[PDB]
């Protein structure tokens, strides 16, 4: 039993940075593996990043390789997503997910409990 | 559509009979989470028509890689476990028996099983999660009345620092034994029969006691037994009322394919 809630989302310019946060409650945080997902309006839900139980193994996708880095803090019962060099097509609602069993899958099958999702929209063409 | 989580459980048994035969609108998965404690045994009962990937074809947790390993037997990580996969007709209906026998000395493990009904639509799933792990990590000096000695056993039991494939996190690999220092009495530290126990833990415990000069101690023997490398130390008459705790770290000791040790933490109480 675990619930999730995202924060830190909003509006940003191209090449900026956002510190997305996701807190949990209920069952022990350090006993579940966390991972971020996003769904662009119209397109389907794709895999973003993933962090293991202790935080040693990180699993990322090709679209956000290097740009997005996932970090977890077992003490704070919170997982973070550091987004850097946001390309304009990153405009999507970013979902937080927790998985009781996790074998490193890059899909939504292993994740059981999900959050709500915050809106992240990035503009471009200077100002 | 979120993946709906259902939960079922019985008395030391996981019954999925006549619970996976319907079709929901969204993806669902019924869970049976169990944590054996006092050497209890577990039964997994489900309909024979369901496709069950359990026991010999389970998903086991690997502490070395901090992930799960697919399609593996659980005896490959907890050898003392033994099971049987038979065909019984429970409550009239043909059922599948997944009876596991959990000994007391069986090493800690963490694996899951997938109970999937064969259908063109895979919206419904069954899962059983098994979490065998020690839950007591803080005990006292077990004074053996026969030999008149104190024992802090880290070679087995709850304070076992032997490399195990149990689901323990970074700040959970902390076991501790508390020995209220009785002057001029023998104190035993039973440790696993390992090569590096004498090579690094024995120098580690020596340096912990020599730094404090007011601690009166005398190392007698390092006796190799059947399975325990017992450190025999006698603490003499102490002067100042002090308190000491020493750390014998084996959590970093890797053991193929997934087993990892624990950090021993012996707390010495010097009270008059
Ligand atoms: C237990 O079982 C599960 C399920 O099979 C396994 O989980 C899989 O784990 C593997 C890795 O171990 C995952 O493989 C990864 O798949 C990614 C999917 O990307 C696809 O889509 C993009 C976009 O179209 C394509 O470009 C891409 O080619 C794929 O078609 C790959 O992107 C990953 O590639 C990575 O490595 C290559 C080589 O270095 C790099 O070039 C890439 O940039 C990237 O870094 C990778 O191949 C797989 O997705 C997981 N799920 C599934 C369903 O297979 C567990 O691993 C398994 N565990 C054990 C212990 O057996
Ligand atoms: C984990 O362990 C379990 C068992 O503990 C494995 O599950 C299966 O266990 C059975 C044990 O009997 C394996 O044997 C299979 O038996 C099937 C039953 O058919 C027999 O009985 C009927 C009458 O009831 C006869 O008419 C029939 O001829 C058989 O005598 C067979 O259908 C199976 O497949 C093939 O067997 C022979 C040999 O080639 C062929 O002649 C058959 O026509 C048929 O094609 C088999 O004999 C069974 O193999 C086990 N399953 C699998 C997939 O192998 C789990 O598999 C195991 N998990 C693993 C290994 O990951
Ligand atoms: C068990 O937890 C303790 C802390 O509660 C860890 O103690 C470490 O002790 C060394 C001794 O010099 C310190 O330098 C470290 O800073 C301590 N760690 C922390 C996180 O404070 C000990 O390592 C733990 N045992 C493990 C993880 O096996
Ligand atoms: C050892 O156990 C004692 C028990 O009081 C505790 O105070 C101490 O922090 C522990 N040390 C380590 C390294 O875990």
Residue numbers in the entry:
A (entry chain C): 1 to 52, 52A, 53 to 82, 82A, 82B, 82C, 83 to 100, 100A, ...
B (entry chain A): 19 to 290
Paper text:
We identified a heteromeric disulfide-linked complex consisting of P. falciparum Plasmodium thrombospondin-related apical merozoite protein (PfPTRAMP) and P. falciparum cysteine-rich small secreted protein (PfCSS) and have shown that it binds RCR to form a pentameric complex, PCRCR. The PCRCR complex functions to anchor the contact between merozoite and erythrocyte membranes brought together by strong parasite deformations. PfCSS is a cryptic 6-Cys protein comprising two ‘degenerate’ 6-Cys domains, and this protein family typically mediates extracellular protein–protein interactions, consistent with PfCSS binding to both PfPTRAMP and PfRipr. The eight conserved cysteines are paired to adopt the characteristic C1–C2 and C4–C5 6-Cys motifs in both D1 and D2 domains.
Crystal structures of nanobodies D2 (inhibitory) and H2 (non-inhibitory) in complex with PfCSS were determined to a resolution of 4.13 Å and 2.00 Å, respectively. Consistent with the competition binning data, D2 and H2 nanobodies bind to non-overlapping sites in PfCSS. H2 competed with PfPTRAMP for binding to PfCSS. D2 nanobody bound to a site distal to the PfRipr and PfPTRAMP binding sites and did not block binding of PTRAMP–CSS to PfRipr. D2 nanobody contacts both the D1 and D2 domains with most contacts targeted to one face of the β-sheet of the D1 domain (buried surface area (BSA) of 655 Å2) and the remaining to a loop in the D2 domain (BSA of 175 Å2). The D2 CDR3 contributes more than half the total BSA (421 Å2), with CDR1, CDR2, FR2 and FR3 contributing the rest. CDR3 and FR3 of D2 form interactions with an N-linked glycan on Asn88 of PfCSS, with a BSA of 378 Å2, which was glycosylated in the recombinant protein. Therefore, binding of D2 nanobody to a glycan deficient PTRAMP–CSS construct was determined using biolayer interferometry. Although affinity for the glycan deficient PTRAMP–CSS was tenfold lower, it showed notable binding (KD = 73 nM compared with KD = 7.5 nM), confirming D2 nanobody can bind to a ‘parasite-like’ PTRAMP–CSS heterodimer. Therefore, D2 and H8 nanobodies inhibit PfCSS and PfPTRAMP function, respectively, and block the function of PCRCR in invasion. Notably, all PfCSS residues contacted by D2 and H2 nanobodies are conserved among all sequences.
